[PDB]
Amino acid sequence: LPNITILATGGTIAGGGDSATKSNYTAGKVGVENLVNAVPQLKDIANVKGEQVVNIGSQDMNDDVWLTLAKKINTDCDKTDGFVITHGTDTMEETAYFLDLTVKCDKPVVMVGAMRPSTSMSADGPFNLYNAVVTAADKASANRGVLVVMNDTVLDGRDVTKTNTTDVATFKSVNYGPLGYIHNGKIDYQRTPARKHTSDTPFDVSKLNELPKVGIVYNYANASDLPAKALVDAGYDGIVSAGVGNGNLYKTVFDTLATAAKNGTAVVRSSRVPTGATTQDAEVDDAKYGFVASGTLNPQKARVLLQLALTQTKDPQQIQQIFNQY
Amino acid sequence: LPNITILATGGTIAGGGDSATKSNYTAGKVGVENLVNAVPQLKDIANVKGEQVVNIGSQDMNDDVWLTLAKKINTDCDKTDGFVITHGTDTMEETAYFLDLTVKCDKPVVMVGAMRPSTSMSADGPFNLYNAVVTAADKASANRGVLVVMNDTVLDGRDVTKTNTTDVATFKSVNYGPLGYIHNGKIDYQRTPARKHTSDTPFDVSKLNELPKVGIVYNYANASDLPAKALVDAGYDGIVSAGVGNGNLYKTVFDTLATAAKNGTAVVRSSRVPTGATTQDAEVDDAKYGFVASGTLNPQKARVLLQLALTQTKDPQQIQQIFNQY
Amino acid sequence: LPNITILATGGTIAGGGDSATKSNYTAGKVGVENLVNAVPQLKDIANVKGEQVVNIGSQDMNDDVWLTLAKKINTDCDKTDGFVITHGTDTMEETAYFLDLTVKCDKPVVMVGAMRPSTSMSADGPFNLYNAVVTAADKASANRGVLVVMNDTVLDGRDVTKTNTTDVATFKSVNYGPLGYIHNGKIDYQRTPARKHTSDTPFDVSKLNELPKVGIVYNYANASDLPAKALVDAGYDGIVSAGVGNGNLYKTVFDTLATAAKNGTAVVRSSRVPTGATTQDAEVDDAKYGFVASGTLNPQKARVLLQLALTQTKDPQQIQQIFNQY
Amino acid sequence: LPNITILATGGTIAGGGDSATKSNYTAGKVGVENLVNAVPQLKDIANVKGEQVVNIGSQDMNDDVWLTLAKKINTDCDKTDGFVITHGTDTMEETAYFLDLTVKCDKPVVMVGAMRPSTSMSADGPFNLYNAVVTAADKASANRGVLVVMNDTVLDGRDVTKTNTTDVATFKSVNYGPLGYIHNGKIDYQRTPARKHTSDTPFDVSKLNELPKVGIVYNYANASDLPAKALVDAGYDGIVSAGVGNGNLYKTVFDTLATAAKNGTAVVRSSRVPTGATTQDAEVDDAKYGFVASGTLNPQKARVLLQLALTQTKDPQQIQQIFNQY
Ligand SMILES: N[C@@H](CC(=O)O)C(=O)O
Ligand SMILES: N[C@@H](CC(=O)O)C(=O)O
Ligand SMILES: N[C@@H](CC(=O)O)C(=O)O
Ligand SMILES: N[C@@H](CC(=O)O)C(=O)O
């Protein structure tokens, strides 16, 4: 049977809450061995090893956990046939993309979480973790980058995003769609990501103890320049704009960032809008102000790639090329 | 024929850009008479009156325009059989909700914009404005609150949100769905909003020259408390959290706002997640910290209702009741 | 606590496999009392009683079970505070709509099923049933017609359809959306159906032992007229076209359905297309030929209405009327 | 500039009404040269030439046009840099897939249609055709099989289907998603189909004047076995079940299709359900009875594959093989 490492970093997948019929619970309170023995059917398909990395709620997720994650995956590559990370759903789309860029293992890394806590009636997490292990054990799952397996679906880490607050089917690759579906412990893969991933990137976090500070401002009607101004005062290496429509800013947030761009801050335009590209050659001359268009990458996902781009260069056009490649 | 007032505040619906096959253009550069005479078929269904309110891009939209808007609609109620506001698509979901709460006209107010500029090949705006006028002229459209009519669909202002950056079909009511569809200049309405709207609210902007400052922070991995802290320094009456999953915050953004709640700032939890409620009785004890759960209202939409709630009260539980009613 | 009767018909909610990990199962081999006792949390929210009506896979559902279900609900109406129907998912949309039109009872009738068998890991049916009892218990569910509760979502019988073959979230209201969502045993209803339903209809099945024969024919490239033909020859009372696009016919089906319609068969043009209305005033002169446009009714839903419409009149214009009203 | 041939078949792209405001029209009454000349921006991006193949409404599309189209494309393959097929929207999914399997040509074949007639206000077809010439001109479109370009979106012939009766955005890839999006004449391709296509298939239509007869039968509550029966009796070569749920049959259709399948008719179980696979290993012993599971192929797509599969073998296991591969 395939040697699958489970890496455990928390999430509702490992959270409980008194009544099976109450929505009240705590993230990251259950250990990796409980999870594993809660799904005895893993024994039949994998030689699972549990390792607890942290035990937090992914709302609390951070760079440290990311760096600890890439490292341990990269370091433990050749002692196992695939990895599975149990993770909170709230920021799984970020970690998954982070790992997607920083992991150099060709072998299946798969993230998985659960929208209902383990004490819930009809809890999602057992079958989630089952199918995630299945995915991790499929030969075909190799060389497709970091995966999220949720609700019977294999999603790529680049596009996977959380579309609903509570639905078990919340995870969806909302622009290019999923890679394959899971029936009966078998996957028919029909799609594979075309953007460069895992081993095909230059990113290398091996020797890194922290990441270039990057923050996110939201644009709305009458948007305040105060969030933006704050981040530059504090010397942020990067601001990602959560812009309106095709990545537009408010007048004040525009000027602040237009300045910031001329004074060394990288600025990437993305969109609060849930699907679709932030394009160049629309209403904002990106070359003129030195901005970068985030493409299909929503804000938080743009934040991930900004940080890792920043650890190569500070130049608007080198970054844009990285948004067009990765 | 029905006396329909068009109110013009800008948008791509009134923007152009050299080549019909280039995506480069300027918002708010075309006047209301050009728009009207660009769609001669309005003459057959309405007695249209054009009035230019401003001529901006809705990325630049603000409170002044909102207040000018409600007022003129409320004031001109009884000189016309319905209104239509031409608006940029970027923040139409906000204005539409604003108007939804502040307008006291039972008569059809309908917003409309276009995702392709008027010089574009196969431009959306003609037919958009046609069908919006149709909507404004339908008796059935009365008493359903402020409407967005886009891509052959009548959407309520509360739920209407912009789901795509570029698609002409971007506007969708992503939790409770549309109210009716438009075929052949006729609408079959099947749905009407159940939340209190227009005349059934207490909001009254008649005598108001400004609105309680409210801002939006975004939560992500390793979120900075700097945006939040900034807004409280400056004495904001309200912060809306763009939280992860079911409205969760990062540890730092949590504490800052937990403080802010104890020191007079209203704090409303919403979600960056595009569909679904921010619920109470989930992972965050709202009563304990004095927070308010934004419900199906995304951040920007929560911002609208926070501002207008703030002009009644500063108390967490009176506000929550307004999020549950409106 | 309310009194809630469960009319169990079968399906996968009541199906079984030899495995929680394999997908191979048999529908409706489990009694009603088993379903009730595997969800003892029902006790906190209602006084439940389960009666077995049939125990079939809903792929085999037929006119007799519907006549049984309906009158049984109308008859036993004031012995209970609410009804929950366990039912297979395959034809549930069809039953829901049928009870939607035939149920003269003024109490919540809620349909529920499962996509995973009860033996299956993370089986959806314990919590489905719970949520369906909640919906059927909530006083606010009255006056919304026959209802379907799947994946934390309350759906109207008219729009509800199965959008996916395997996914737990298959059931959606693809045109007008859901009536309400369910969190922590509570429903935030924001919507009600506008087409008249339940007691508002003239359809009285209480003396019928038998429904007009209505069959359905698929259109597609190079369509055979053999099925149309074979239904006319058995003197079916009505035929529904699952047409292409907006109710369009393949030329030999058009000939057969047109002749048949002059000779007294009713024929409805519906569409194989999964969302959107089959409208009038496109490419087919419905009035010329005696055809009825289905509207948003898909073929099998439109068969439900058409059957019930044939019990009132055999007149094309009058069936249009019903098709515009119910 | 590339050389792009346009094989025009008709549809609404080439349809006309008496009005830009009314919805009443006739499909395919406009010549190819008209289409080309109403979009003179084609000049900047290609050397276009339009040949008229037929001028039908695609609701009337049939096996002969497909045989014509296919060989004409294979024959005229190296006279051009690319092909664009104008075509009605109703059966376009069916043609696309057919050319997907039959086109041995190694150049972009792109299908395009319109949902609004050319006379209509904000008609979608000028820009559709433009975008289809872009797609057919882009060198990056090679090696992705026969393609469909609608609403700024490049879709693979296999997954693409018409999800809505009237909306300009009807065409989606409902299972695996789009191949690429189109902005400002440019395509960000992030995906390619994995099922083998075009030259990768053993289907050679180049000497066929005639395709195996394959019909389609709908399942629904109380289904008539009359259509199945009537197709067996005309010695159809194959039958597709538009089943309920995951390929399920109504009992009398099951009997008829099972007997027919032992007697040499091939029968595929597809599904009326608009998304998701008709899988094996659920409720039907496909192997026992000689049935083939369609997978993600919907009935009409599955008829395309089944027809072409009948030209290779009459053997159930071997048609499964094709159904797992193409
Ligand atoms: N707050 C949780 C949500 C979940 O896991 O369901 C998290 O850690 O993301
Ligand atoms: N930036 C534009 C976008 C549009 O109208 O299409 C606006 O004013 O919202
Ligand atoms: N064949 C089953 C499917 C299910 O219930 O999940 C039925 O319709 O009974
Ligand atoms: N009946 C038309 C529909 C369209 O093209 O929009 C066709 O399929 O030809």
Q: HEC profile for chain A?
A: CCEEEEEEEECHHHCECCCCCCCCCECCCCCHHHHHHCCHHHHHCCEEEEEEEEEECHHHCCHHHHHHHHHHHHHHHHHCCEEEEECCCCCHHHHHHHHHHHCCCCCCEEEECCCCCCCCCCCCHHHHHHHHHHHHHCHHHCCCCCEEEECCEEEECCCEEECECCCCCCEEECCCCCCEEEECCEEEECCCCCCCCHHHCCCCCCCCCCCCCEEEEECCCCCCCHHHHHHHHCCCCEEEEEEECCCECCHHHHHHHHHHHHCCCEEEEEECCCECCECCCCCCCHHHHCCEECECCCHHHHHHHHHHHHCCCCCHHHHHHHHCCC
Report the residue of B100, B156, B176, B326 to disrupt the C interface, i.e. the one with the largest count of C CBs within 10 Å. B176
C89 is catalytic: yes
D89 among annotated binding-site residues = yes
C236 and C201 in one domain? Answer: no
**Joined tokens for residue C97:** 């709509």
Place of tokens 């790992």: A99
C311: containing domain: 213-326
Place of tokens 């990765």: A326
A80 is catalytic: no
Dihedral over alpha carbons A136, A139, A143, A145 (to 10 degrees): -10
Q: Tell me how far CA of residue B127 lies from CA of A84, B41, B117, C51, in angstroms.
A: 51, 10, 13, 55
Q: Do C279 and B184 touch (CB under 8 A)?
A: yes
Between CA A287 and CA A294, with CA A288 as vertex, the angle to 5 degrees is: 40
Please give the interface size between A and C, counted as residue pairs whose CB atoms are below 8 Å apart: 64
Instruction: Find out whether B300 and B310 touch, Cβ atoms under 8 Å.
Output: no
- Tell me which chain C residue has its CA closest to the CA of residue B179: C176
Instruction: Find out whether A55 and A23 touch, Cβ atoms under 8 Å.
Output: no
Q: Which of B24, B35, B59 to mutate to test the pocket of ligand 2 (most atoms within 8 A of CB)?
A: B59
* Phi and psi torsions of D285, nearest 5°: -85, 85
Place of tokens 């309170």: A29
3-class state of residue D242 by DSSP: strand
| SS3 assignment for chain C | CCEEEEEEEECCCCCECCCCCCCCCECCCCCHHHHHHCCHHHHHCCEEEEEEEEEECHHHCCHHHHHHHHHHHHHCHHHCCEEEEECCCCCHHHHHHHHHHHCCCCCCEEEECCCCCCCCCCCCHHHHHHHHHHHHHCHHHCCCCCEEEECCEEEECCCEEECCCCCCCCEEECCCCCCEEEECCEEEECCCCCCCCHHHCCCCCCCCCCCCCEEEEECCCCCCCHHHHHHHHCCCCEEEEEEECCCECCHHHHHHHHHHHHCCCEEEEEECCCCCCECCCCCCCHHHHCEEECECCCHHHHHHHHHHHHCCCCCHHHHHHHHHHC
For residue C39, the Cα-to-chain-centroid distance in whole angstroms is 25
A89 among annotated binding-site residues = yes
Other beta carbons within 10 Å of A71:
16
Instruction: Find out whether A173 and A160 touch, Cβ atoms under 8 Å.
Output: yes
Domain of D248: which CATH number? 3.40.50.40
B231 and B180 in one domain? Answer: no
Give DSSP secondary structure letters for B228-260.
Answer: HHHHHHTT-SEEEEEEBTTTB--HHHHHHHHHH
C189 and C73 in one domain? Answer: yes
Strand order in the sheet with A153-156: A47-56, A3-10, A82-86, A109-112, A147-150, A153-156, A180-183, A186-189
Query: Can you tell me the distance from the alpha carbon of B144 to that of A59, in angstroms, rounded to the nearest whole number?
Result: 38
Instruction: Find out whether D80 and D107 touch, Cβ atoms under 8 Å.
Output: yes
Place of tokens 């309520």: B156
Segments of chain B assigned E as strands: 3-10, 47-56, 82-86, 109-112, 147-150, 153-156, 160-162, 171-173, 180-183, 186-189, 214-218, 238-243, 266-271, 292-293
D259 and D125 in one domain? Answer: no
Domain count, chain D: 2
Q: CB within 8 A of C94, min separation 6: which ones?
A: C61, C300, C301, C303, C304, D220, D221
For residue D29, the Cα-to-chain-centroid distance in whole angstroms is 22
Place of tokens 């379907």: C148
Radius of gyration of the CA atoms of chain B, in A: 20
Query: Can you tell me the distance from the alpha carbon of C101 to that of C326, in angstroms, rounded to the nearest whole number?
Result: 8
For residue B18, the Cα-to-chain-centroid distance in whole angstroms is 30
Query: Is the beta carbon of C233 within 6 A of some atom in ligand 4?
Result: no
C61 and C106 in one domain? Answer: yes
Radius of gyration of the CA atoms of chain C, in A: 20
User: Nearest ligand to the C-alpha of residue B86?
Assistant: 2
Residue type at C95 in one-letter notation: T
Query: Can you tell me the distance from the alpha carbon of C119 to that of A127, in angstroms, rounded to the nearest whole number?
Result: 12
Query: Can you tell me the distance from the alpha carbon of A13 to that of A137, in angstroms, rounded to the nearest whole number?
Result: 20
Q: Which residues pair with D36 in a beta bridge?
A: none
Residue C189 touches partner B, C-beta closer than 8 Å: yes
Dihedral over alpha carbons B288, B292, B296, B299 (to 10 degrees): -120
Query: Can you tell me the distance from the alpha carbon of A161 to that of A90, in angstroms, rounded to the nearest whole number?
Result: 10
Strand D3-10 with D82-86, pairing: parallel
D146 and D62 in one domain? Answer: yes
C261 and C167 in one domain? Answer: no
Residue D16 touches partner C, C-beta closer than 8 Å: no
3-class state of residue D171 by DSSP: strand
Task: Please report the sign of the dihedral spanned by the C-alpha atoms of residue B79, residue B82, residue B85, residue B91.
Answer: positive
Query: Can you tell me the distance from the alpha carbon of C140 to that of C128, in angstroms, rounded to the nearest whole number?
Result: 19
D25 to chain B, closest Cα gap in Å: 12
Nearest to C187 by CA among B37, B295, D249, B188: B295
Distance of CA A96 from the midpoint of ligand 1 (Å)? 14
End-of-domain residue from the set D182, D212, D242: D212
3-class state of residue D216 by DSSP: strand
Q: CB-based burial of residue A73 (10 Å sphere; 0-12 exposed, 13-18 middle, 19+ buried)?
A: buried
Q: Tell me how far CA of residue B86 lies from CA of C107, C291, D20, D146, in angstroms.
A: 45, 40, 21, 40
The H or E element spanning position D4 is strand D3-10
Residue type at A205 in one-letter notation: V
Catalytic residues of B: 12, 89
How many Cα neighbours within 13 Å face the side chain of C146?
32
Query: Can you tell me the distance from the alpha carbon of C299 to that of D242, in angstroms, rounded to the nearest whole number?
Result: 12
Q: Which residues pair with D183 in a beta bridge?
A: D186
Q: Output DSSP code: residue D164.
A: -
Between CA B35 and CA B43, with CA B38 as vertex, the angle to 5 degrees is: 95
Chain B neighbors of C280, CB-CB under 8 A: 184
Q: CB-based burial of residue A258 (10 Å sphere; 0-12 exposed, 13-18 middle, 19+ buried)?
A: middle
Query: Can you tell me the distance from the alpha carbon of C122 to that of C264, in angstroms, rounded to the nearest whole number?
Result: 51
For residue B120, the Cα-to-chain-centroid distance in whole angstroms is 25
Q: CB-based burial of residue C76 (10 Å sphere; 0-12 exposed, 13-18 middle, 19+ buried)?
A: middle
End-of-domain residue from the set B155, B185, B212: B212
Query: Can you tell me the distance from the alpha carbon of A95 to that of A114, in angstroms, rounded to the nearest whole number?
Result: 15
Chain D neighbors of C98, CB-CB under 8 A: 221
Reported residue count of chain D is 326
Chains in touch with D (≥3 Cβ pairs < 8 A): A, B, C
Other beta carbons within 10 Å of D323:
20
Residue C178 touches partner B, C-beta closer than 8 Å: yes
Other beta carbons within 10 Å of C285:
11
For residue C298, the Cα-to-chain-centroid distance in whole angstroms is 11
Other beta carbons within 10 Å of C149:
30
Query: Can you tell me the distance from the alpha carbon of B41 to that of D20, in angstroms, rounded to the nearest whole number?
Result: 9
**Closest ligand 2 atom to the C-alpha of B92?**
9
Domain of B10: which CATH number? 3.40.50.1170
Query: Can you tell me the distance from the alpha carbon of D292 to that of B213, in angstroms, rounded to the nearest whole number?
Result: 63
Nearest to A15 by CA among B315, C65, B246: B246
Segments of D202-278 assigned E as strands: 214-218, 238-243, 266-271
Between CA A14 and CA A19, with CA A17 as vertex, the angle to 5 degrees is: 135
Instruction: Find out whether D144 and D193 touch, Cβ atoms under 8 Å.
Output: yes
Query: Can you tell me the distance from the alpha carbon of B45 to that of B3, in angstroms, rounded to the nearest whole number?
Result: 10
Nearest to B207 by CA among B67, B49, B54: B67
Query: Which alpha helices (H) appear in chain D, and where do they start and end?
Result: 32-37, 63-75, 92-102, 125-137, 226-233, 251-262, 286-289, 299-310, 316-325
Angular region, D79: left φ>0, alpha ψ -120 to 50, beta rest? alpha
End-of-domain residue from the set A212, A228, A257: A212
A56 and A140 in one domain? Answer: yes
Q: Tell me how far CA of residue A319 lies from CA of A238, A284, A286, A311, A323, in angstroms.
A: 11, 17, 12, 10, 6
**Joined tokens for residue B191:** 């749905």
* Phi and psi torsions of D118, nearest 5°: -65, -25
D227 and D166 in one domain? Answer: no
Q: CB within 8 A of C265, min separation 6: which ones?
A: C231, C232, C236, C237, C238, C239, C257
How was it solved? X-ray
Instruction: Find out whether C103 and C96 touch, Cβ atoms under 8 Å.
Output: no
* Phi and psi torsions of C237, nearest 5°: -80, -35
Other beta carbons within 10 Å of A54:
16
Task: Please report the sign of the dihedral spanned by the C-alpha atoms of residue D126, residue D127, residue D129, residue D130.
Answer: positive
Nearest to D184 by CA among D45, D46, D47: D45
- Tell me which chain B residue has its CA closest to the CA of residue C154: B176
Strand B109-112 with B82-86, pairing: parallel
A195 and A217 in one domain? Answer: no
Task: Please report the sign of the dihedral spanned by the C-alpha atoms of residue C137, residue C141, residue C147, residue C151.
Answer: negative
Across the interface, which of D164, D220, D273 has its CB nearest the CB of C273? D164
Query: Can you tell me the distance from the alpha carbon of D163 to that of D160, in angstroms, rounded to the nearest whole number?
Result: 9
Task: Please report the sign of the dihedral spanned by the C-alpha atoms of residue D118, residue D121, residue D123, residue D126.
Answer: positive
Query: Can you tell me the distance from the alpha carbon of A300 to that of C299, in angstroms, rounded to the nearest whole number?
Result: 43
Residue type at D63 in one-letter notation: D
Distance of CA A26 from the midpoint of ligand 1 (Å)? 9
Give DSSP secondary structure letters for B190-221.
Answer: -----S--GGGS----TT-SS---EEEEE--T
Instruction: Find out whether D159 and D296 touch, Cβ atoms under 8 Å.
Output: yes
C281 and C249 in one domain? Answer: yes
**Joined tokens for residue A125:** 């997490």
Longest dimension (CA), chain D: 59
Place of tokens 């024994």: A43
Q: Which residues pair with A217 in a beta bridge?
A: A241
Instruction: Find out whether D286 and D293 touch, Cβ atoms under 8 Å.
Output: yes
D226 and D78 in one domain? Answer: no
**Joined tokens for residue D166:** 């009237």
Other beta carbons within 10 Å of A66:
23
Describe chain D by its helix, strand, coil percentages, rounded to 5. Answer: 35, 25, 45
Instruction: Find out whether C111 and C147 touch, Cβ atoms under 8 Å.
Output: yes
Query: Can you tell me the distance from the alpha carbon of D192 to that of B13, in angstroms, rounded to the nearest whole number?
Result: 35
